[PDB]
Amino acid sequence: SVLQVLHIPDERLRKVAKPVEEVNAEIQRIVDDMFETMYAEEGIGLAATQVDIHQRIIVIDVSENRDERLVLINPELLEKSGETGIEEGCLSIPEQRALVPRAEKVKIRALDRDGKPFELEADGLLAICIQHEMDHLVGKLFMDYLSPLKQQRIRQKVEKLDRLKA
Ligand SMILES: OCN(O)CCCc1ccccc1
Numbered sequence: 001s002v003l004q005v006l007h008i009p010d011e012r013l014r015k016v017a018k019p020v021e022e023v024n025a026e027i028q029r030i031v032d033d034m035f036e037t038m039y040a041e042e043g044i045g046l047a048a049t050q051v052d053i054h055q056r057i058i059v060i061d062v063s064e065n066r067d068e069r070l071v072l073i074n075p076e077l078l079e080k081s082g083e084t085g086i087e088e089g090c091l092s093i094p095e096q097r098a099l100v101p102r103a104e105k106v107k108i109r110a111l112d113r114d115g116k117p118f119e120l121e122a123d124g125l126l127a128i129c130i131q132h133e134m135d136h137l138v139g140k141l142f143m144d145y146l147s148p149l150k151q152q153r154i155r156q157k158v159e160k161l162d163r164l165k166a
Protein backbone atom coordinates (compact mmCIF):
# COMPACT_ATOMS: atom_id res chain seq x y z
CA SER A 1 0.00 0.00 0.00
CA VAL A 2 1.10 3.58 -0.59
CA LEU A 3 0.96 5.87 2.43
CA GLN A 4 0.34 9.60 2.54
CA VAL A 5 3.46 11.57 3.44
CA LEU A 6 3.05 14.36 5.97
CA HIS A 7 4.07 17.84 4.78
CA ILE A 8 5.26 20.79 6.83
CA PRO A 9 3.99 22.51 8.90
CA ASP A 10 2.47 19.35 10.41
CA GLU A 11 3.37 19.03 14.11
CA ARG A 12 3.33 15.24 13.83
CA LEU A 13 6.65 15.61 12.01
CA ARG A 14 8.11 16.78 15.33
CA LYS A 15 7.24 13.61 17.25
CA VAL A 16 10.13 11.53 18.58
CA ALA A 17 9.96 7.92 17.40
CA LYS A 18 10.01 5.03 19.86
CA PRO A 19 12.26 2.01 19.26
CA VAL A 20 10.76 -0.99 17.45
CA GLU A 21 10.04 -3.65 20.08
CA GLU A 22 10.21 -6.61 17.70
CA VAL A 23 10.70 -6.96 13.95
CA ASN A 24 7.61 -9.01 13.13
CA ALA A 25 5.09 -9.32 10.30
CA GLU A 26 3.43 -6.04 11.29
CA ILE A 27 6.72 -4.15 11.12
CA GLN A 28 7.61 -5.86 7.85
CA ARG A 29 4.33 -4.74 6.28
CA ILE A 30 5.15 -1.17 7.35
CA VAL A 31 8.63 -1.47 5.85
CA ASP A 32 7.25 -2.71 2.54
CA ASP A 33 4.60 0.02 2.40
CA MET A 34 7.29 2.60 3.17
CA PHE A 35 9.37 1.37 0.22
CA GLU A 36 6.32 1.45 -2.04
CA THR A 37 5.61 5.00 -0.87
CA MET A 38 9.23 6.09 -1.28
CA TYR A 39 9.44 4.73 -4.84
CA ALA A 40 6.03 6.09 -5.83
CA GLU A 41 7.08 9.56 -4.64
CA GLU A 42 10.54 9.19 -6.23
CA GLY A 43 12.52 9.61 -3.02
CA ILE A 44 15.79 7.99 -1.93
CA GLY A 45 14.79 7.73 1.71
CA LEU A 46 11.77 7.72 4.00
CA ALA A 47 11.40 7.68 7.79
CA ALA A 48 8.35 6.18 9.50
CA THR A 49 7.69 9.53 11.18
CA GLN A 50 6.92 10.96 7.74
CA VAL A 51 3.98 8.58 7.31
CA ASP A 52 2.70 9.14 10.86
CA ILE A 53 4.22 5.93 12.24
CA HIS A 54 6.31 6.91 15.22
CA GLN A 55 8.78 4.07 15.45
CA ARG A 56 12.46 3.98 14.50
CA ILE A 57 12.12 2.57 11.00
CA ILE A 58 13.92 3.92 7.93
CA VAL A 59 13.96 2.71 4.33
CA ILE A 60 16.56 3.89 1.82
CA ASP A 61 17.63 3.31 -1.78
CA VAL A 62 20.43 5.44 -3.20
CA SER A 63 21.08 3.20 -6.21
CA GLU A 64 20.93 4.46 -9.79
CA ASN A 65 18.63 1.63 -10.88
CA ARG A 66 16.38 1.97 -7.82
CA ASP A 67 16.71 -1.72 -6.95
CA GLU A 68 18.86 -1.72 -3.81
CA ARG A 69 16.72 -1.73 -0.68
CA LEU A 70 18.31 -0.72 2.61
CA VAL A 71 16.38 -1.06 5.87
CA LEU A 72 17.45 0.61 9.10
CA ILE A 73 15.42 -0.40 12.15
CA ASN A 74 16.49 1.03 15.52
CA PRO A 75 19.56 2.69 13.98
CA GLU A 76 22.30 3.81 16.36
CA LEU A 77 25.14 6.18 15.48
CA LEU A 78 28.45 4.59 16.51
CA GLU A 79 30.98 6.97 14.96
CA LYS A 80 31.12 9.90 12.56
CA SER A 81 33.79 12.10 11.00
CA GLY A 82 34.35 15.05 8.71
CA GLU A 83 31.83 17.49 7.30
CA THR A 84 29.99 17.79 4.02
CA GLY A 85 26.85 19.18 2.47
CA ILE A 86 24.71 18.76 -0.63
CA GLU A 87 21.38 20.25 -1.64
CA GLU A 88 19.00 17.94 0.19
CA GLY A 89 15.36 17.35 -0.64
CA CYS A 90 12.58 15.82 1.46
CA LEU A 91 9.19 14.34 0.64
CA SER A 92 7.79 16.23 3.63
CA ILE A 93 9.07 19.51 2.15
CA PRO A 94 7.97 18.91 -1.48
CA GLU A 95 10.01 20.39 -4.32
CA GLN A 96 12.32 22.38 -2.04
CA ARG A 97 16.06 21.75 -1.77
CA ALA A 98 18.78 23.27 0.39
CA LEU A 99 22.29 22.46 1.54
CA VAL A 100 22.73 21.64 5.22
CA PRO A 101 25.77 20.58 7.30
CA ARG A 102 26.29 16.82 7.73
CA ALA A 103 29.09 14.51 8.86
CA GLU A 104 30.98 13.16 5.83
CA LYS A 105 31.18 9.59 7.08
CA VAL A 106 29.18 7.59 9.60
CA LYS A 107 29.17 4.14 11.16
CA ILE A 108 25.90 2.82 12.48
CA ARG A 109 24.41 -0.41 13.72
CA ALA A 110 20.78 -1.34 13.20
CA LEU A 111 18.41 -4.23 12.50
CA ASP A 112 17.48 -5.31 8.98
CA ARG A 113 14.06 -6.29 7.62
CA ASP A 114 14.50 -9.72 9.22
CA GLY A 115 15.48 -8.25 12.57
CA LYS A 116 19.12 -9.28 12.13
CA PRO A 117 21.67 -6.85 13.61
CA PHE A 118 24.29 -5.39 11.28
CA GLU A 119 26.88 -2.63 11.19
CA LEU A 120 27.28 -0.21 8.31
CA GLU A 121 30.05 2.24 7.41
CA ALA A 122 28.93 4.83 4.88
CA ASP A 123 30.16 7.94 3.11
CA GLY A 124 29.00 10.08 0.20
CA LEU A 125 25.27 10.27 -0.47
CA LEU A 126 24.43 7.25 1.67
CA ALA A 127 25.99 8.82 4.78
CA ILE A 128 24.06 12.04 4.19
CA CYS A 129 20.80 10.17 3.60
CA ILE A 130 21.25 8.14 6.78
CA GLN A 131 21.71 11.32 8.83
CA HIS A 132 18.75 13.02 7.14
CA GLU A 133 16.50 10.04 7.89
CA MET A 134 17.71 9.65 11.47
CA ASP A 135 16.94 13.34 12.02
CA HIS A 136 13.29 12.63 11.12
CA LEU A 137 13.12 10.07 13.93
CA VAL A 138 13.95 12.77 16.46
CA GLY A 139 11.57 15.29 14.92
CA LYS A 140 14.16 17.25 12.94
CA LEU A 141 13.87 18.52 9.35
CA PHE A 142 16.58 19.86 7.03
CA MET A 143 14.97 23.30 6.97
CA ASP A 144 15.72 23.53 10.71
CA TYR A 145 19.35 24.31 9.84
CA LEU A 146 18.41 27.32 7.71
CA SER A 147 17.82 30.97 8.58
CA PRO A 148 14.33 32.16 9.60
CA LEU A 149 13.99 33.89 6.22
CA LYS A 150 14.97 30.74 4.33
CA GLN A 151 12.55 28.71 6.43
CA GLN A 152 9.67 31.14 5.88
CA ARG A 153 10.21 31.07 2.12
CA ILE A 154 10.22 27.26 2.09
CA ARG A 155 7.12 27.17 4.29
CA GLN A 156 5.19 29.43 1.91
CA LYS A 157 6.25 27.49 -1.18
CA VAL A 158 5.12 24.15 0.26
CA GLU A 159 1.81 25.59 1.43
CA LYS A 160 1.24 27.06 -2.03
CA LEU A 161 1.98 23.69 -3.64
CA ASP A 162 -0.50 21.83 -1.45
CA ARG A 163 -2.99 24.63 -2.01
CA LEU A 164 -2.82 23.99 -5.76
CA LYS A 165 -2.91 20.23 -5.24
CA ALA A 166 -6.14 20.65 -3.28
O1 LIG B 1 13.00 11.82 4.38
C1 LIG B 1 13.45 11.69 3.03
N1 LIG B 1 12.70 11.93 1.91
O2 LIG B 1 11.36 12.32 2.06
C2 LIG B 1 13.29 11.74 0.50
C3 LIG B 1 14.64 12.46 0.13
C4 LIG B 1 15.81 12.30 1.12
C5 LIG B 1 17.10 13.00 0.69
C6 LIG B 1 17.23 13.66 -0.61
C7 LIG B 1 18.44 14.29 -1.00
C8 LIG B 1 19.55 14.29 -0.13
C9 LIG B 1 19.41 13.59 1.26
C10 LIG B 1 18.19 12.99 1.58
Ligand code: NI
Binding pocket: 089, 090, 091, 092, 132, 133, 136
Ligand atom coordinates in the same frame (compact mmCIF):
# COMPACT_ATOMS: atom_id res chain seq x y z
NI1 NI C 1 13.15 13.84 4.71
